UniProtKB/Swiss-Prot annotation, chain A:
Protein name: Small ribosomal subunit protein eS6A
UniProt source species: Saccharomyces cerevisiae (strain ATCC 204508 / S288c)
Family membership noted in the UniProt record: Belongs to the eukaryotic ribosomal protein eS6 family.
Biological role: Component of the ribosome, a large ribonucleoprotein complex responsible for the synthesis of proteins in the cell. The small ribosomal subunit (SSU) binds messenger RNAs (mRNAs) and translates the encoded message by selecting cognate aminoacyl-transfer RNA (tRNA) molecules. The large subunit (LSU) contains the ribosomal catalytic site termed the peptidyl transferase center (PTC), which catalyzes the formation of peptide bonds, thereby polymerizing the amino acids delivered by tRNAs into a polypeptide chain.
Subunit and partners: Component of the small ribosomal subunit (SSU). Mature yeast ribosomes consist of a small (40S) and a large (60S) subunit. The 40S small subunit contains 1 molecule of ribosomal RNA (18S rRNA) and 33 different proteins (encoded by 57 genes). The large 60S subunit contains 3 rRNA molecules (25S, 5.8S and 5S rRNA) and 46 different proteins (encoded by 81 genes). Interacts with snoRNA U3. uS11 interacts with MPP10. Component of the ribosomal small subunit (SSU) processome composed of at least 40 protein subunits and snoRNA U3.
Subcellular location: Cytoplasm; Nucleus, Nucleolus
Chain positions with Phosphothreonine modification: T104
Gene field: RPS6A
Curated annotation (Swiss-Prot), chain B:
Span of domain S4 RNA-binding: 41-104
Full protein name: Small ribosomal subunit protein eS4A
Species assigned in the record: Saccharomyces cerevisiae (strain ATCC 204508 / S288c) (Baker's yeast)
Superkingdom in the source lineage: Eukaryota
The protein's role, per its UniProt record: Component of the ribosome, a large ribonucleoprotein complex responsible for the synthesis of proteins in the cell. The small ribosomal subunit (SSU) binds messenger RNAs (mRNAs) and translates the encoded message by selecting cognate aminoacyl-transfer RNA (tRNA) molecules. The large subunit (LSU) contains the ribosomal catalytic site termed the peptidyl transferase center (PTC), which catalyzes the formation of peptide bonds, thereby polymerizing the amino acids delivered by tRNAs into a polypeptide chain.
UniProtKB/Swiss-Prot annotation, chain C:
Compartments, as annotated in UniProt: Cytoplasm
Organism: Saccharomyces cerevisiae (strain ATCC 204508 / S288c) (Baker's yeast)
Note: Present with 15900 molecules/cell in log phase SD medium.
Pfam families in the cross-refs: Ribosomal_S8e
Entry GO terms, CC: 90S preribosome; cytosol; cytosolic small ribosomal subunit
Phosphoserine: residues bearing it: S65, S68, S72, S85, S142, S143, S146, S149
The protein's name in its UniProt record: Small ribosomal subunit protein eS8A
Swiss-Prot record, chain E:
Record has Transmembrane helix as a keyword: no
One BP term from GO: ribosomal small subunit biogenesis
Name of this protein: Small ribosomal subunit protein uS4A
Similarity field: Belongs to the universal ribosomal protein uS4 family.
Additional observations: Present with 106000 molecules/cell in log phase SD medium.
Main location: cytoplasm
GO molecular function: rRNA binding; structural constituent of ribosome
Organism lineage string: Eukaryota, Fungi, Dikarya, Ascomycota, Saccharomycotina
Subcellular locations according to the entry: Cytoplasm; Nucleus, Nucleolus
Oligomeric and partner information: Component of the small ribosomal subunit (SSU). Mature yeast ribosomes consist of a small (40S) and a large (60S) subunit. The 40S small subunit contains 1 molecule of ribosomal RNA (18S rRNA) and 33 different proteins (encoded by 57 genes). The large 60S subunit contains 3 rRNA molecules (25S, 5.8S and 5S rRNA) and 46 different proteins (encoded by 81 genes). Interacts with snoRNA U3. uS11 interacts with MPP10. Component of the ribosomal small subunit (SSU) processome composed of at least 40 protein subunits and snoRNA U3.
Length: 159, 260, 188, 146, 131
RNA sequence: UAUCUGGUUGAUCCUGCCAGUAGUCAUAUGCUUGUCUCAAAGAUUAAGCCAUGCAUGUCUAAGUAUAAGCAAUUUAUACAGUGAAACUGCGAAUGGCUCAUUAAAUCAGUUAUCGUUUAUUUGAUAGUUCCUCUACAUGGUAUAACUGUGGUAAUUCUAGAGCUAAUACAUGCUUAAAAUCUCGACCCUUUGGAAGAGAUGUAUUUAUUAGAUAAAAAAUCAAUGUCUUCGGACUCUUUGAUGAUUCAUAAUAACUUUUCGAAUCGCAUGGCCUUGUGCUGGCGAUGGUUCAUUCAAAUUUCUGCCCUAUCAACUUUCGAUGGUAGGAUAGUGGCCUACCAUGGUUUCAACGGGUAACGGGGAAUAAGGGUUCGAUUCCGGAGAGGGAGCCUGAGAAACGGCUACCA
RNA sequence: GGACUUUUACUUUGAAAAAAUUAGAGUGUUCAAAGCAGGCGUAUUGCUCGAAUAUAUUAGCAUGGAAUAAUAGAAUAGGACG
RNA sequence: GCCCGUCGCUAGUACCGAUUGAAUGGCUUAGUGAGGCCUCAGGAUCUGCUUAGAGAAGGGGGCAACUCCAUCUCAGAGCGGA
RNA sequence: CUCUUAAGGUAGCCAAAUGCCUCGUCAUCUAAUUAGUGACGCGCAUGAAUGGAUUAACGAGAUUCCCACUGUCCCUAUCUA
């Protein structure tokens, strides 16, 4: 049952200290390492299965494989990621491009679509307007009271 | 103990809340906030132990979650928020304006002030510092920092703050004579003038005091909270004016007021 | 691992101590960054409460300051010459605080000869105006001047490379340079 | 027992960040930073017209005096730049309504400013861990006997 | 981790278990006030002792002592409110001469009898404990 | 609540024990047992071993919904309700249990941080980012759940192929005016002057500087600052906290595998005029750098422990006491390392040994003084079968975390 | 007028000082052990007293005292006061 | 009358004692040394910058000439990261 | 108390280089010991300068065991003069 591990070499099972972002191990809590068994990277006869990936296609067709083909499941969801998919440009308004899929109830079928994220909206532009306002306004106001005090200070001296 | 503590065993809580002995193992335990947790007062204890506006601690939250209560003008919603001295608390939906200010025992009395006055408080300054970019600032006893202060303001002097703008609006210095509130110790709840400050280099200056009855008591500089001029308070003192009477004189005032 | 605790020590009376508790992390210590000379290699180390420290363990080029001339220039650091703590640091050429190292002199040359318009012991108008004023002030020590001929300057390291990651120092002047000079011909 | 000719240690002996420009001829060959200790302790002449270094000196150095100001008699000067003070007292045993003579030895740093010997009532002041045993620092020194 | 719901005991058995003298006197008492056992006298004998002690201590103090006057008159005012101390025997000297039957008399038991209602303490017993 | 009595003689008075007497927040055991209130309870011996179940998880209006989920309608052809799963965030360092270790340790009262770290709460705090033709009407990759191909007897095991999100990961624009600086084309020779070119956020690291004072007057050298009546003159000139600092804070020259300086979310739907989906604009949420506050932590000053000499010298092994420098740490420090000295404790009991020893708040015993006890409702400490090591995080040398040896 | 013991012990009075426990004030848990409650009234939109006080015998800190008991000082004068 | 010691029987207790006696714990000389941590390396697989040649874009602005930014596609030649 | 024949084995020590029975009995050491040691003693037939008991040091003396060691052995092989 034990999985081969990328580039251990050897043709035998061993036990490594595995971590996060490492194959053959999903951490059950943050910082949890685990001594787990693992199979080598070299092919021996002790293999139950052996995954291969096809690089160059050969002479004849492979019935389950070359012949048939299967679709992706999800389409693009980000603004530009939709743009990039169909090849649009910055000013092309993705909204009318997003993938929609039909769902059948009993007698009322309907379609649905993502929720274009990262999409520039009237709302977003209003938020940037606020941040800008607050920053410059608060700066001037902080300079208002700055000189205001410095003059209140001179009259602790000049008098 | 591997980190900060999160519980309060009901017995290790401050006595001046007057929670019962039985009826549970734990006390509220003030959250982190404006006042030191031992010197504070949770809103749960005010709103159900001190006002009886609630019974369950559940109904405490339900009141708070209604935003029914401001502290110093800002609407606070943490069940165990740590309110304290000079704070205001405003239950709007019933036209009530209080001010957590001391008993004559050492407790937080239910002191009701007007719909005005709640528009300000007082603040004992703790430090006066030169901040960065040359800006100066003071720090008051409730974790308020006010940048650009009156150069006259030194440490221990009190400060008249607004309550919707910050900003100091006049203040009082610490010299002989001033009217002083004791904020802890054996004389917590008492009020009086000054007479003397006995400074001690190395540490701990004591401040002799005299009330409006020619009784002289002493405390540590730490506990003294100036609140105005002789016979002239900058706020409304609770009943009894924090004058303190003996158990003898107590008993007489009881039986005499008792009957008729 | 390492523990900076005092419990494992003896009492001054000389009495031994039974172990009171196991080791806590908040008394730990770490192994030295022994910072050698070479291509820049720095690793960081997560310290108490967020906070980064910088394990500089390979350094050429530090930022040094000619103290009297009021400026600073980043040089290269040739080798380690002396070390009051341990000569092994010297032999393996190891950079610590209070190290005494030889650094490039050419960035300090290019400043002097252009700030003052002079050469170290062998046009335009405002250029001459400046030089003329800056003169009668631009003669330095002969114990410092003659060093430029070799192209390497005696300097002392004031940073803490296992901590900051920088090997910043200051070129030896005054009696300080006088003192380390004396020590450099008695032994080296 | 003896104070070095300053530059005795393999490292150069100087006060941190007290610089004197070589391009500027003066009177004193080397500047001298000293401070006033506090609590009305008068800094000695020796702490000023000296070239001793001592980064653990109350004046002229990088320590400070806060906490407890103690006093005991000198019992061992045999160390270097630190001594042993004895602090005598009387513990009270309630049962016998009486007392017993106890004593403590308290290691203290002694600046080169003071030239102190066994005898000598001494006034030390607390000052952060200087060095394992040592936690206090000579600050004032009352006479011997003659 | 709760709070120790405090308590204390009420009586105090005699130092000497068999005093024909003492045992007689105790039995006389148990019969005229109609008690149930010796514990009901031990309870009162003990109560009496603290009172006499409390007063024994207050009297050693200098008179007009702030604590003596408060804690004494408070003691006296309580003893009178129950019918054990005479209306004008309001002195600590007179509470040290107080004895067991003073207390014993004021029981509901010997009140249900002492004013009609019963015509017997043993009758009065059952009358009280039967609502 | 200041008490005694029985037993040595043939008899007497003493010494002197034993025995009686009385209580025990004192445990067990025996016999007996109706009512009310209150309610301790596998500490003692074995910190001995543990079957099985449970004890830590968590969502707002407000980070991520293309469930081939459900309700259904929305005005909804981007999304819009409710929402499995999964990612992101926070918590899991609190609690609860026990008393094994521990005798100058812990603990107590009392200090110290002018010797440090601190998620969070609370109050403050950011016009400077590019550059001698730039996305800002908004940059770029990847992954889970899912899909399908699977392995193993077995577990909170997971492989390889395919998809797609972010407040995840990685990138990256932006803003007024002045001023002070350095480099200096050039012009005109005098008291000589400059055209515009670059530099100036914060944080990082190093050096240098300011951060004045108890009371007063000149002389010059050095480099240059106002002026006027062009001879020479110069006044009213500024600086904070502490018992004390190289303090706060500012400045100069630079340094940097460059820290931060909002590419985020919910409600609201307003106002201007050249009417463009133009400009402005409300109430919050969540972030954020630095300081303050708070909840803390870590060390720390003084004094205080039971039996013991059939324990009198101990300590420097292989750091014991100190000095100098360094390294290390969040920081002080023989904490560690080099070099240097020979110091440090002790009959006022060191050192060692024993304890059926966690410290204290307190408990039992009532003339007073004392005697004995404290595993155990609160506080502090320590530990999670024994040791050591460590990942994560603000915090753990954590065990309902991991790694190893041992049992 | 502020600081002020040659250096102490002692003694007075205060200060900082957890709660529970103990001592002890009030209160009719029906009594009591307890608890910290509660009490009055037009009881149909109310009023009101409380939750004291004492104890800490060591040490530290602040303070009034100078009896008792310790201690220093001018003898080759290397003395005091200005 | 009282009374002392050997000797004699029974039971109990401690002591001495071959066994280079035994057990548990603490601390240890010598030799051996797991693991994670730090470090010199290693480099299954990944990947940022730069450069010439090629194909397809749009103009920084012209009667023919001239010249930037961004995106992405395959021989290479460099220096870097995980 | 008695007889032989003058006394009648004391202090000590032992299956001892002296014990027949005998490979004594108990204990210890071993898997197992006619061995060794510690004990016991009616000792065929120990015993006091015919010297008795103890004894540190010494021994190419006799005897047991442990560690180390090793071709003594299991079990033999190979090489040189």
């Amino acid at each position: 049952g034990f999985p081969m591990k990328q580039g251990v070499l050897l043709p035998t099972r061993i036990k490594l200290l595995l971590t996060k972002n490492v194959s053959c191990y999903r951490p059950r809590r943050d910082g949890e390492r685990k001594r787990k068994s693992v199979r080598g990277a070299i092919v021996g006869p002790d293999l139950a299965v052996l995954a291969l990936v096809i690089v160059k296609k050969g002479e004849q067709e492979l019935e389950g494989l070359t012949d048939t083909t299967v679709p992706k499941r999800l389409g693009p969801k980000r603004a530009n990621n939709i743009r990039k998919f169909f090849g649009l440009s910055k000013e092309d308004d993705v909204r009318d491009f997003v993938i929609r899929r039909e769902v059948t109830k009993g007698e009322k079928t309907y379609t649905k679509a993502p929720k274009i994220q990262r999409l520039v909206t009237p709302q977003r532009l209003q938020r940037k307007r606020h941040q800008r306002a607050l920053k410059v306004r608060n700066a001037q106001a902080q300079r208002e009271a700055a000189a205001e005090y410095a003059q209140l200070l001179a009259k602790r001296l000049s008098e | 103990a591997r980190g900060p503590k999160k519980h309060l065993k009901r017995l290790a809580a401050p006595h001046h809340w007057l929670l019962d002995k039985l009826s549970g193992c734990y006390a509220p335990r003030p959250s982190a906030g404006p006042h030191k947790l031992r010197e504070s007062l949770p809103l749960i204890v005010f709103l159900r132990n001190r006002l009886k506006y609630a019974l369950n601690g559940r109904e405490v939250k339900a009141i708070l979650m209604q935003r029914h209560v401001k502290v110093d003008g800002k609407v606070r919603t943490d069940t165990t928020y740590p309110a304290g001295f000079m704070d205001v608390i405003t239950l709007d939906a019933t036209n009530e304006n209080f001010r957590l200010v001391y008993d004559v025992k050492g407790r937080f009395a239910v002191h009701r002030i007007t719909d005005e006055e709640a528009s300000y408080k007082l603040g004992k300054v703790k430090k006066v510092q030169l901040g960065k970019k040359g800006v100066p600032y003071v720090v008051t006893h409730d974790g308020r920092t006010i940048r650009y202060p009156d150069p006259n303001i030194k440490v221990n002097d009190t400060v008249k703050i607004d309550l919707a703008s910050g900003k100091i609006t006049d203040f009082i210095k610490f010299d002989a004579g001033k009217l002083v509130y004791v904020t802890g110790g054996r004389n917590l709840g008492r009020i009086g003038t000054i007479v003397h400050k006995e400074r001690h280099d190395g540490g701990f200056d004591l401040v002799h005091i005299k009330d409006s009855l020619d009784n002289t008591f002493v405390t540590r500089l730490n506990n003294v909270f100036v609140i105005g001029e002789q016979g002239k308070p900058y706020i409304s003192l609770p009943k009894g004016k924090g004058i303190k009477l003996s158990i003898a004189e107590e008993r007489d005032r009881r039986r005499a007021q008792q009957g008729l | 691992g390492i523990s900076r605790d005092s419990r494992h020590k003896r009492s001054a009376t000389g009495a031994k101590r039974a172990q009171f508790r196991k080791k806590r992390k908040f008394e730990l210590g770490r192994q030295p960054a022994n910072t050698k000379i070479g291509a820049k290699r720095i690793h960081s180390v997560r310290t108490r409460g967020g906070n980064k420290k910088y394990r500089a363990l390979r350094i050429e080029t530090g930022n040094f300051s000619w103290a009297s001339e009021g400026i600073s220039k980043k040089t290269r650091i040739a080798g380690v010459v002396y070390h009051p703590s341990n000569n092994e640091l010297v032999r393996t050429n190891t950079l610590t605080k209070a190290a005494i190292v030889q650094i490039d002199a050419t960035p300090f040359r290019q400043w002097f000869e252009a700030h003052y318009g002079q050469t170290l012991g062998k046009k335009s108008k405002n250029a001459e105006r400046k030089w003329a004023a800056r003169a009668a002030s631009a003669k330095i020590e002969s114990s410092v001047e003659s060093q430029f001929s070799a192209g390497r300057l005696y300097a002392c390291i004031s940073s803490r490379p296992g901590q900051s990651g920088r090997c910043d120092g200051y070129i030896l002047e005054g009696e300080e340079l006088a003192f380390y000079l004396r020590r450099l011909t008695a032994k080296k | 027992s003896t104070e070095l000719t300053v530059q005795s240690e393999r490292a150069f002996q100087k006060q941190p960040h007290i610089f004197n420009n070589p391009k500027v001829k003066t009177s004193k060959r080397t500047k001298r930073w000293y401070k006033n200790a506090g609590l009305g302790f008068k800094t000695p002449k020796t702490a000023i017209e000296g070239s001793y270094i001592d980064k653990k000196c109350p004046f002229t150095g990088l320590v400070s005096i806060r906490g407890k100001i103690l006093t005991g008699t000198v019992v061992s000067t045999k160390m270097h730049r630190t001594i042993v003070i004895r602090r005598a007292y009387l513990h009270y045993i309630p049962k016998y309504n009486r007392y017993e003579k106890r004593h403590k030895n308290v290691p203290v740093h002694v600046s080169p400013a003071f030239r102190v010997q066994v005898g000598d009532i001494v006034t030390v002041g607390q000052c952060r861990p200087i060095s394992k045993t040592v936690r206090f620092n000579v600050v004032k020194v009352s006479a011997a006997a003659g | 981790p709760r709070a120790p719901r405090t308590y204390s005991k009420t009586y105090s058995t005699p130092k000497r278990p068999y005093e024909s003298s003492r045992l007689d006197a105790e039995l006389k008492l148990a019969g005229e006030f109609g008690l149930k056992n010796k514990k009901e006298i031990y309870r009162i004998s003990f109560q009496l002792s603290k009172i006499r002690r409390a007063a024994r201590d207050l009297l050693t103090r200098d008179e007009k002592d702030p604590k003596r006057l408060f804690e004494g008159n408070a003691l006296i005012r309580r003893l009178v409110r129950v019918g054990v101390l005479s209306e004008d025997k309001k002195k600590l000297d007179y509470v040290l001469a107080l004895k067991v039957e003073d207390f014993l008399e004021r029981r509901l038991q010997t009140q249900v009898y002492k004013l009609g209602l019963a015509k017997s303490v043993h009758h009065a017993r059952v009358l009280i404990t039967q609502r």
